[PDB]
Amino acid sequence: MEVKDANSALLSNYEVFQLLTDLKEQRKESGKNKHSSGQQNLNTITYETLKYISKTPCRHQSPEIVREFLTALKSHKLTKAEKLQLLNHRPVTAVEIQLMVEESEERLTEEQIEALLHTVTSILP
Amino acid sequence: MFVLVEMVDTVRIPPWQFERKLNDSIAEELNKKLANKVVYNVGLCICLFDITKLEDAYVFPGDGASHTKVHFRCVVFHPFLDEILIGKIKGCSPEGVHVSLGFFDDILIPPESLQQPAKFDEAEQVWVWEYETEEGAHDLYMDTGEEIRFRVVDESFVDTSYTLVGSISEPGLGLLSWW
Amino acid sequence: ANQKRITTPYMTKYERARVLGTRALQIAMCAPVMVELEGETDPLLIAMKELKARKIPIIIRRYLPDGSYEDWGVDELIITD
Amino acid sequence: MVLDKMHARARGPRAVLTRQPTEGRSRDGGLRLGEMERDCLIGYGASMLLLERLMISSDA
Helix, strand or coil: CEECCCCCCCCCHHHHHHHHHHHHHHHHHHCCCCCCCCCCHHHHHHHHHHHHHHHCCCCCCCCHHHHHHHHCCHHHCCCHHHHHHHHHHCCCCHHHHHHHCCCCCCCCCCCCHHHHHHHHHHHCC | CCEEEEEECCECCCHHHCCCCCHHHHHHHHHHCCCCCCCECCECCCCCCCCCCCCCCECCCCCCCCEECCCEEEEECCCCCCCCCCEEECCCCCCCCCEECCCCCEECCCCCCCCCCCCCECCCCECCEEECCCCCCEEECCCCCCEECCCCCCCCCCCCCCEECCCCCCCCCCCCCCC | CCCCCCCCCECCHHHHHHHHHHHHHHHHHCCCCCCCCCCCCCCCCCHHHHCCCCCCCCEEEECCCCCCCEEEECCCCECCC | CCCCCCCCCCCCCCCCCCCCCCCCCCCCCCCCCCHHHHHHHHCCCCHHHHHHHHHCCCCC
């Protein structure tokens, strides 16, 4: 019915993804018959969100890449939106960030973004 | 990153578990009536991750149920600053073409938001990609399920129809058959 | 909320009778059942079983519109007598 | 006698036709809490005894 604050989060992206996996694996635990007829669609949203997440390249890996994408961009006047984008795609390759993806080249003056490129190649698929 | 939302709604704790375990039961109660379609904007069949406080857990003047309220955080998918994802074409229609991202279900896409020469061929209900590059009339015949790297701008709750629109035709890349 | 000094070492009869009533509803929905669950085992006398409580682990909080929340645990004070 | 005076009421709702409870006759026999009757009802001295009387009066 009523809500007060509609924006109260700034967290680790891939961490939120794995926590959504945990939410998925926890909702299915409610399969007992007493709490069966009441609420089940949380399973549906968890499964569909996990499916679209599996569509994303954001899997196979840890939230440490989130702190990488923060510490390598917020330290060079990048806004939260640019690193946010780059997290939501989890770039498959390095030159992806430069030419396959945009707004991620000049705020680092194309100099220290190369370090994040090497990190992406090292960990990201 | 996904937005936590402070929420304040009636909580009806049944007397079945007045002495039993509370916290997870409280979470189940919160998930009871926060369903997908219509509860509030923005809210759809979602949950919490951290507690803030639990306020007055009344029963009634003398009646059965309880009068607990909510101080929590609700994990909504607010339409962010056009976060880059993959948008699978959900369906087809003469007015627009449906898309899927992961936030909502229905995502309307007007014709010109497809490739600029690519039109909706209503003679076959296929949004055939008139991929007019390299001077060639390369009709990339791709029906519902076209691969497009979508990023969306808005979310809706009130009208007769959960409908979105992910803005396409990226000037820096083009090639809407991929972007 | 230690504004509990202006009550005689007794709850009033009205409050005690109504808390017995709400415990009746409690033990009459499914179970908060207590020290003896159904040792007193009888047909449809809903009220006359939790009357025999004599412990009553619950809290009640009594006020005044120009005053604060004079709180009281049922345990910490004397009974109907 | 006490056979011409057999009267009792099963339930009383408040209707929509005339929007009345079962007052006096024409709905059942039984009671009619008129002026002095509810005057006594409210004059008890117990809080949610009065609350219960309110919550069970005709409809809630």
